[PDB]
Design a protein around this motif. Structure first.
Motif, PDB file in Angstrom:
ATOM      1  N   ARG A  45       0.827  -1.201   0.000  1.00  0.00           N
ATOM      2  CA  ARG A  45       0.000   0.000   0.000  1.00  0.00           C
ATOM      3  C   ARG A  45       0.864   1.255   0.000  1.00  0.00           C
ATOM      4  O   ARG A  45       0.536   2.244  -0.664  1.00  0.00           O
ATOM      5  CB  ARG A  45      -0.941  -0.010   1.205  1.00  0.00           C
ATOM      6  CG  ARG A  45      -1.761  -1.282   1.334  1.00  0.00           C
ATOM      7  CD  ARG A  45      -1.882  -1.717   2.785  1.00  0.00           C
ATOM      8  NE  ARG A  45      -0.577  -1.937   3.399  1.00  0.00           N
ATOM      9  CZ  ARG A  45      -0.135  -1.285   4.466  1.00  0.00           C
ATOM     10  NH1 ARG A  45      -0.869  -0.362   5.066  1.00  0.00           N
ATOM     11  NH2 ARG A  45       1.075  -1.567   4.943  1.00  0.00           N
ATOM     12  N   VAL A  46       1.971   1.231   0.747  1.00  0.00           N
ATOM     13  CA  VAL A  46       2.907   2.352   0.731  1.00  0.00           C
ATOM     14  C   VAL A  46       3.506   2.523  -0.659  1.00  0.00           C
ATOM     15  O   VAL A  46       3.612   3.643  -1.174  1.00  0.00           O
ATOM     16  CB  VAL A  46       3.996   2.148   1.803  1.00  0.00           C
ATOM     17  CG1 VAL A  46       5.291   2.842   1.402  1.00  0.00           C
ATOM     18  CG2 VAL A  46       3.510   2.648   3.155  1.00  0.00           C
ATOM     19  N   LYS A  63      -2.359   7.397 -13.865  1.00  0.00           N
ATOM     20  CA  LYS A  63      -3.596   8.156 -13.958  1.00  0.00           C
ATOM     21  C   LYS A  63      -3.411   9.323 -14.915  1.00  0.00           C
ATOM     22  O   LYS A  63      -2.343   9.941 -14.956  1.00  0.00           O
ATOM     23  CB  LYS A  63      -4.038   8.676 -12.584  1.00  0.00           C
ATOM     24  CG  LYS A  63      -4.268   7.589 -11.546  1.00  0.00           C
ATOM     25  CD  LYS A  63      -5.725   7.164 -11.509  1.00  0.00           C
ATOM     26  CE  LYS A  63      -6.081   6.538 -10.171  1.00  0.00           C
ATOM     27  NZ  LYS A  63      -5.533   7.324  -9.031  1.00  0.00           N
ATOM     28  N   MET A  84       2.242   1.558  -3.561  1.00  0.00           N
ATOM     29  CA  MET A  84       1.231   1.946  -4.536  1.00  0.00           C
ATOM     30  C   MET A  84       0.636   3.323  -4.270  1.00  0.00           C
ATOM     31  O   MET A  84      -0.068   3.850  -5.138  1.00  0.00           O
ATOM     32  CB  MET A  84       0.113   0.901  -4.577  1.00  0.00           C
ATOM     33  CG  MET A  84      -0.886   1.009  -3.438  1.00  0.00           C
ATOM     34  SD  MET A  84      -2.407   0.097  -3.763  1.00  0.00           S
ATOM     35  CE  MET A  84      -1.761  -1.366  -4.569  1.00  0.00           C
ATOM     36  N   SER A  85       0.895   3.917  -3.108  1.00  0.00           N
ATOM     37  CA  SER A  85       0.398   5.246  -2.780  1.00  0.00           C
ATOM     38  C   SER A  85       1.474   6.320  -2.901  1.00  0.00           C
ATOM     39  O   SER A  85       1.272   7.440  -2.422  1.00  0.00           O
ATOM     40  CB  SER A  85      -0.195   5.256  -1.369  1.00  0.00           C
ATOM     41  OG  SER A  85      -1.133   4.207  -1.205  1.00  0.00           O
ATOM     42  N   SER A  86       2.604   6.003  -3.523  1.00  0.00           N
ATOM     43  CA  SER A  86       3.705   6.950  -3.626  1.00  0.00           C
ATOM     44  C   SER A  86       3.344   8.125  -4.528  1.00  0.00           C
ATOM     45  O   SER A  86       2.560   8.000  -5.472  1.00  0.00           O
ATOM     46  CB  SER A  86       4.956   6.252  -4.161  1.00  0.00           C
ATOM     47  OG  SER A  86       5.818   7.174  -4.803  1.00  0.00           O
ATOM     48  N   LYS A  87       3.935   9.280  -4.227  1.00  0.00           N
ATOM     49  CA  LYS A  87       3.784  10.489  -5.026  1.00  0.00           C
ATOM     50  C   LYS A  87       5.162  10.937  -5.496  1.00  0.00           C
ATOM     51  O   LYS A  87       6.122  10.922  -4.718  1.00  0.00           O
ATOM     52  CB  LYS A  87       3.100  11.603  -4.228  1.00  0.00           C
ATOM     53  CG  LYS A  87       2.993  12.928  -4.971  1.00  0.00           C
ATOM     54  CD  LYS A  87       1.810  12.932  -5.929  1.00  0.00           C
ATOM     55  CE  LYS A  87       2.134  13.668  -7.220  1.00  0.00           C
ATOM     56  NZ  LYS A  87       3.154  12.954  -8.036  1.00  0.00           N
ATOM     57  N   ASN A 106      -3.149   3.262  -8.871  1.00  0.00           N
ATOM     58  CA  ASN A 106      -4.466   2.942  -8.339  1.00  0.00           C
ATOM     59  C   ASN A 106      -4.414   1.578  -7.651  1.00  0.00           C
ATOM     60  O   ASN A 106      -3.340   1.049  -7.349  1.00  0.00           O
ATOM     61  CB  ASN A 106      -5.511   2.992  -9.449  1.00  0.00           C
ATOM     62  CG  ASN A 106      -5.424   1.808 -10.388  1.00  0.00           C
ATOM     63  OD1 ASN A 106      -4.389   1.569 -11.010  1.00  0.00           O
ATOM     64  ND2 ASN A 106      -6.513   1.056 -10.496  1.00  0.00           N
ATOM     65  N   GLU A 107      -5.586   1.005  -7.368  1.00  0.00           N
ATOM     66  CA  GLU A 107      -5.634  -0.324  -6.765  1.00  0.00           C
ATOM     67  C   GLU A 107      -4.931  -1.351  -7.644  1.00  0.00           C
ATOM     68  O   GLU A 107      -4.229  -2.235  -7.140  1.00  0.00           O
ATOM     69  CB  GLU A 107      -7.085  -0.736  -6.514  1.00  0.00           C
ATOM     70  CG  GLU A 107      -7.953   0.367  -5.928  1.00  0.00           C
ATOM     71  CD  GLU A 107      -8.678   1.170  -6.992  1.00  0.00           C
ATOM     72  OE1 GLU A 107      -8.092   1.396  -8.072  1.00  0.00           O
ATOM     73  OE2 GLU A 107      -9.833   1.576  -6.748  1.00  0.00           O
ATOM     74  N   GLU A 162       0.776   8.159 -10.318  1.00  0.00           N
ATOM     75  CA  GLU A 162      -0.030   7.684  -9.201  1.00  0.00           C
ATOM     76  C   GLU A 162      -0.578   6.305  -9.534  1.00  0.00           C
ATOM     77  O   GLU A 162      -1.129   6.097 -10.620  1.00  0.00           O
ATOM     78  CB  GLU A 162      -1.175   8.654  -8.898  1.00  0.00           C
ATOM     79  CG  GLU A 162      -0.858   9.669  -7.813  1.00  0.00           C
ATOM     80  CD  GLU A 162       0.499  10.317  -7.999  1.00  0.00           C
ATOM     81  OE1 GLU A 162       0.630  11.182  -8.891  1.00  0.00           O
ATOM     82  OE2 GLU A 162       1.436   9.961  -7.257  1.00  0.00           O
TER      83      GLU A 162
END
Lengths: 398, 49, 387
Positions: C299-300, C323, C302-305, C317-318, C315
């Motif tokens: 999750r960390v 995006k 896949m949530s990176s910016k 997503n699941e 970004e």
């Protein structure tokens, strides 16, 4: 020549004796079976590709029967690619390589002996109506295949004369907190709870269920996936039965019949797996899954779907006793629900009233214009609408 | 038929009248051989195309 | 004390500019414990060779991520499949690029596979919005009988089931297109003229040729099509009014990997926490246990910016996808491609050049047509309809 690949240090002792034992168990004309035992150890994907290829190059074995000890299914995909690579049919009896795998790689000869997540939903619903358990609540967790799980739920309740009611939550996080899990667990309108949980997170939710006050015999839980509250049931599909030697004999039976499917058209022994990397070509492949439709053995159908899993199994439902033991409670043999431990005196066996005292018995008689008692319709199998069940003192009548 | 001919002249369209295969009107007719149900009779023919 | 990154590249020359790419990895945000090694190999000729080459070289350095790209030979994604199994069973993260397929989308099998490049199945989003500005009401589509082809159909039918009254037809054809013509006249009766194709490269040219003798490419037609059937042998035998798609950075990996490596480095800073940072299993000569910290930062990851590289908006997503990617709608005329628009998550249409359409007509042809003759049913009722 069949490769009897095992897994686990405890399986080394019985490897030697099981070779000749299964050689004479199944015999077919024009076919020689020479099982080879393996005493390999370690689950690292090296003996599965280094010495396994050595048997293909040197021993020239056709048809591989796999056996595993651990319940972890993460090692199944490794041999799934291998089966599609060398075009060797691999059959797993039980263990970690027992869970379904859909979709499978194209041109794969992987054969699975187990139960998927679709037939399990069907069989548990018959037991629900058997004991008059129409009201139910179904929940689930973050799972790879809960989308097909939830979609299939309403299809079952869309029919039948009985009017089903459904409720449930969406997901739960064991790490959110003990109070967090119990916070959304109150949105329940039934005494029966269904869950879909992984092995690793199975314990925390079960342990957190005690804080909700739902652990006794008054409530029941149905296990969908492959400090314990009372009233736990599960589906094994003869997982606890057929012993070990009988189980390993079934795998060699279908493999032997698998050849006779294609030798009756023409007698040819393929040599696709004779070499792993000697030939840099894999285009040669045909009828990889075109066989194994009508496979009959042990008076049980062994038909396999296009995905490569059994579609006509002998399912048996396993119940948990108060002494922390697993025992069978019913049978599912060819769409039959004969069952055991009869259902008379509802709210009796397997379901107690935790509270209420609203279960007050009423005595009645028959007088034609006031109360009418008639037998139920056998085809419907249930009480007609605008009627109530009337147990005698036992055959249900409307 | 008389009403149909009036509409054809007014809105300028042509037709070819044909009867129905089974002499029954529409009905949901939920059956176990299908998923949920399927239309039958006249009503099903309109949706088929 | 040392954080390692593993990768597999295409060629030995591609092993020369890799060290240039990882050279700037150390000089980045923070670099508390960012000390990299090369940890790269070539693309093995056989999948089985790549199956056991992952552990002996990349895992031997105890890496925490894997970079996978398409092989130089245009084969059926020979590189990602062996990595996704051995590394997937070890719960080792892997970053993907230049491989856009819908097979590595469901999380049932490939638990850990994140990639910035959107798959081929994501092209369905641009098709719906593109027809909105042109005001195209209902469409018919042709889909090859395959999982890759069927994925696009599923995406479309969840989008025009709430804001639209479905599509006219969803007729399908077998991938082995040989004299595939019998279903063409079936499509040439509903008066749609707005057909949509999503086949592969080889079979698309067969459809166009089968559409030649039946004057299916004449005036009054619009072909809203995907991307792959513009290149290859599908360039020939094609009409002169196609509206094919494109990707801005397709088939480019030199810039992508430099952008991709930094995204991992940002996520490493969040790894150091109260949870154990125990090293993954050393080698694979002997080991059975699977470490627990692997899925603890997916999750960390896949949530990176990360605002640098391509659009600065990588970004995840699941699933594994970026995006608001850029597609930059193409156009074809007289055996030549030409740009007629740009897509950046929203419909943007510059003047550029006047849009050409099949049949030589220079205006925008509405696909709708009306048939006066229509069939009629009746029943036998005595006072109303005598027989």
């Amino acid at each position: 020549n069949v490769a009897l690949v095992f897994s686990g240090p405890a399986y080394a002792a019985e490897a030697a004796r099981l070779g000749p034992a299964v050689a004479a168990a199944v015999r077919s004309p024009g076919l020689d079976v020479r099982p080879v035992a393996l005493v390999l150890n370690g689950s690292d994907p090296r003996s599965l590709v280094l010495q396994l290829c050595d048997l293909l190059s040197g021993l020239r074995v056709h048809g591989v029967v796999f056996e595993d000890d651990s319940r972890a299914p993460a090692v199944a995909p490794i041999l799934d690619f291998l089966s599609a690579q060398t075009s060797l049919p691999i059959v797993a009896v039980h263990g970690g390589a027992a869970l379904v795998l859909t979709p499978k790689e194209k041109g794969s000869t992987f054969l699975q002996l187990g139960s998927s997540t679709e037939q399990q939903l069907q069989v548990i619903f018959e037991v629900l109506e058997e004991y008059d358990w129409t009201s139910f609540v179904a929940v689930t967790t973050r799972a790879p295949g809960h989308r097909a799980f939830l979609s299939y739920i309403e299809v079952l309740t869309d029919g039948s004369l009985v009017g089903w009611e459904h409720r449930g939550a969406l997901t739960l996080d064991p790490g959110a907190g003990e109070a967090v899990l119990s916070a959304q667990l109150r949105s329940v309108s039934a005494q029966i709870r269904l869950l879909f949980c992984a092995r690793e997170e199975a314990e925390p939710v079960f342990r957190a269920a005690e804080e909700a006050g739902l652990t006794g015999s008054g409530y029941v839980w149905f296990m969908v996936g492959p400090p314990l509250p009372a009233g736990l049931f599960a589906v094994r599909s003869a997982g606890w039965r057929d012993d070990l030697a009988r189980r390993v004999a079934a795998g060699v039976a279908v493999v032997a019949r698998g050849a006779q499917a294609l030798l009756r058209d023409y007698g040819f022994l393929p040599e696709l797996g004779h070499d792993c990397r000697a030939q840099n070509r894999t285009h040669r492949g045909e009828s990889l899954h075109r066989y194994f439709m009508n496979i009959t053995w042990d008076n049980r159908d062994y038909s396999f779907n296009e995905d490569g899993f059994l579609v006509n199994p002998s399912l048996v439902v396993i119940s948990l006793t108060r002494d922390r033991t697993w025992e069978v409670v019913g049978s599912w043999e060819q769409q039959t629900l004969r069952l055991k431990y009869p259902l008379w005196s509802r709210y009796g066996r397997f379901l107690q009233p935790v509270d209420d005292t609203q279960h007050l018995t009423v005595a009645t008689l028959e007088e034609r214009p006031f109360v009418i008692v008639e037998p139920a319709d056998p085809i419907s199998g249930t009480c007609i609408r605008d009627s109530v069940p009337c147990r005698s003192q036992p055959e249900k009548r409307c | 038929i008389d009403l149909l001919i009036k509409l054809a002249r007014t809105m300028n369209f042509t037709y070819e009248v044909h009867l129905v295969a089974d002499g029954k009107f529409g009905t949901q007719e939920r059956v176990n051989n299908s998923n949920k149900k399927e239309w039958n009779g006249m009503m099903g023919e309109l949706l088929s195309g | 004390k040392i954080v390692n990154i593993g990768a597999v590249l295409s060629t030995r020359k591609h092993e020369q500019m890799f060290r240039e790419a990882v050279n700037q990895a150390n000089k980045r945000h923070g670099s508390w414990k960012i000390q990299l090694n090369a940890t790269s190999v070539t693309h093995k000729p056989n999948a089985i060779q790549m199956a056991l080459s992952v552990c002996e070289d990349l895992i031997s350095s105890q890496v925490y991520a894997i970079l996978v790209s398409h092989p130089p030979t245009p084969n059926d994604h020979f590189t990602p499949t062996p990595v996704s199994y051995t590394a997937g069973f070890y719960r080792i993260p892997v970053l993907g690029l230049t491989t856009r397929m819908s097979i590595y989308s469901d999380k049932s099998i490939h638990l850990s596979f994140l990639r910035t490049v959107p798959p081929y199945s994501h092209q369905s989003s641009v098709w719906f919005e593109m027809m909105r500005v042109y005001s195209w009401n209902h469409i018919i589509l042709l889909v090859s009988d395959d999982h890759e082809g069927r994925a696009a159909q599923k995406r479309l039918e969840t989008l025009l089931e709430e804001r639209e009254s479905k599509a006219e037809k969803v007729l399908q054809f077998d991938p082995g297109t040989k004299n595939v013509t019998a279903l063409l006249m079936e499509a040439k009766e509903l008066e749609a003229r707005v057909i949509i194709l999503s086949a592969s490269e080889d079979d698309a040219a067969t459809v166009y040729r089968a559409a030649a003798m039946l004057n299916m490419t004449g005036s009054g037609y619009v072909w809203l099509v995907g991307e792959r059937e513009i290149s290859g042998n599908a360039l020939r035998y094609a009409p002169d009014g196609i509206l094919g798609l494109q990707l801005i950075n397709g088939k480019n990996e030199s810039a992508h990997i430099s952008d991709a490596v930094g995204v991992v480095a940002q996520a490493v800073h969040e790894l150091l926490e109260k949870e154990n940072i125990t090293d993954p299993p050393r080698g694979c000569v002997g080991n059975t246990n699977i470490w627990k910290t692997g899925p603890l930062f997916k999750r960390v990851l896949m949530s990176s910016k990360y605002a640098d590289g391509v659009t600065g908006r990588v970004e995840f997503n699941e699933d594994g996808d970026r995006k608001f990617a850029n597609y930059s709608i193409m156009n074809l005329q007289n055996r030549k491609l030409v740009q007629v628009g740009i897509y950046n998550g929203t419909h943007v249409i510059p003047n550029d050049r006047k849009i050409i359409w099949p049949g030589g007509e220079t205006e925008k042809p509405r696909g709708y047509q009306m048939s006066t003759r229509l069939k009629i049913v009746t029943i036998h009722q005595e006072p109303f309809v005598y027989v």
